[PDB]
Amino acid sequence: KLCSLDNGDCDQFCHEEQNSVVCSCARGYTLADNGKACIPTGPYPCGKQTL
Amino acid sequence: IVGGQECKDGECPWQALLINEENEGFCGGTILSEFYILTAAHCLYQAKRFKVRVGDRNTEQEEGGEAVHEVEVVIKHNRFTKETYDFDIAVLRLKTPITFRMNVAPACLPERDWAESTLMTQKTGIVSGFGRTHEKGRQSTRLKMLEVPYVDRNSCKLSSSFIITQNMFCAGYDTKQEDACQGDSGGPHVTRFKDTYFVTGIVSWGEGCARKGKYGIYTKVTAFLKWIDRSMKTR
Numbered sequence A: 001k002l003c004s005l006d007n008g009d010c011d012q013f014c015h016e017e018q019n020s021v022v023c024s025c026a027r028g029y030t031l032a033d034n035g036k037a038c039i040p041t042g043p044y045p046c047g048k049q050t051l
Numbered sequence B: 001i002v003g004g005q006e007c008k009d010g011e012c013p014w015q016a017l018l019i020n021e022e023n024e025g026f027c028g029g030t031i032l033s034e035f036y037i038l039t040a041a042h043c044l045y046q047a048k049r050f051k052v053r054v055g056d057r058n059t060e061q062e063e064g065g066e067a068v069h070e071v072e073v074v075i076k077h078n079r080f081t082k083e084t085y086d087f088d089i090a091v092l093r094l095k096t097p098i099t100f101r102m103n104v105a106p107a108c109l110p111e112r113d114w115a116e117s118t119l120m121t122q123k124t125g126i127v128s129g130f131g132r133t134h135e136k137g138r139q140s141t142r143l144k145m146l147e148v149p150y151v152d153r154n155s156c157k158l159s160s161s162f163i164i165t166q167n168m169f170c171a172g173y174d175t176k177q178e179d180a181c182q183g184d185s186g187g188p189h190v191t192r193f194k195d196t197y198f199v200t201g202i203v204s205w206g207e208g209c210a211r212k213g214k215y216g217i218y219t220k221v222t223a224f225l226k227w228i229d230r231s232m233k234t235r
């Protein structure tokens, strides 16, 4: 736990499941395998500058 | 946008411009999804009939990647009134789906709690629009973006000549000449957290533009987060 240590080492939203920290992502993102970083399912995900 | 910076290619994708019968840009807006635009609640007064444009960075030059969408329904916040300007928030549902491309993507809608502590507590923030270059000046052609610092909730109420409800918040500068203005209204205020942007707030109002001792007043998205959903999911 400690979503305030560094966002729980998450990528986006961070929660505290009592015991420890729980990461998650916004519409259009799937939580990576390590349960932290976020992965976009499409080519035009929310929150990303389009290059 | 007073002072600030020019949105280069791809930087401000979530941007959205409401245009009137004369195809004139009067208000801003934020792209939430395919058929949903976030805008101020008062911007639904500034005109009789309007469309919303997307992927436009120049109000004169047809840079190919522009596109216009009609409004299918308008969801204005009931607890609104210009008497107080409380609940300055409106969700628009487009007749046809925004197709995403370069210069046209959406902004993430964060979770209330994590937003109220990680986004809002951030140093700066991003506001943008096609607004005026200075208080009593001309509208802008090119789309601008300004990094406006989060302003102490308390010293927000002093500086102001009007009530500042917790349904809204300050952001901008004291003396420096950077702020939003007529036209930027209804547009976006987004926080940049770990290389991604969220819809932290809506351009609402302010005593002049970049006036010393005054801050730019935005609508608190989190304060309406759950309201925003019910609108998209309709109700």
Ligand SMILES: O=C([C@H](CNS(=O)(=O)c1ccc2cc(Cl)ccc2c1)NCC1CCN(c2ccncc2)CC1)N1CCS(=O)(=O)CC1
Pocket: B042, B043, B046, B082, B083, B084, B085, B086, B135, B162, B163, B179, B180, B181, B182, B183, B185, B203, B204, B205, B206, B207, B208, B209, B210, B215, B216, B217, B218
């Ligand atoms: O603030 C204004 C305009 C001024 N236009 S502006 O200088 O180009 C301006 C507008 C919005 C800004 C937003 C930000 Cl974040 C920063 C700078 C801004 C600068 N009227 C001034 C004020 C008139 C009275 N108000 C209240 C509020 C609560 N209770 C009572 C009265 C708020 C705005 N509003 C909002 C746009 S409107 O409905 O078309 C006209 C009324």
Ligand SMILES: [Ca+2]
Pocket: B056, B058, B059, B060, B061, B062, B063, B066
């Ligand atoms: Ca154009």
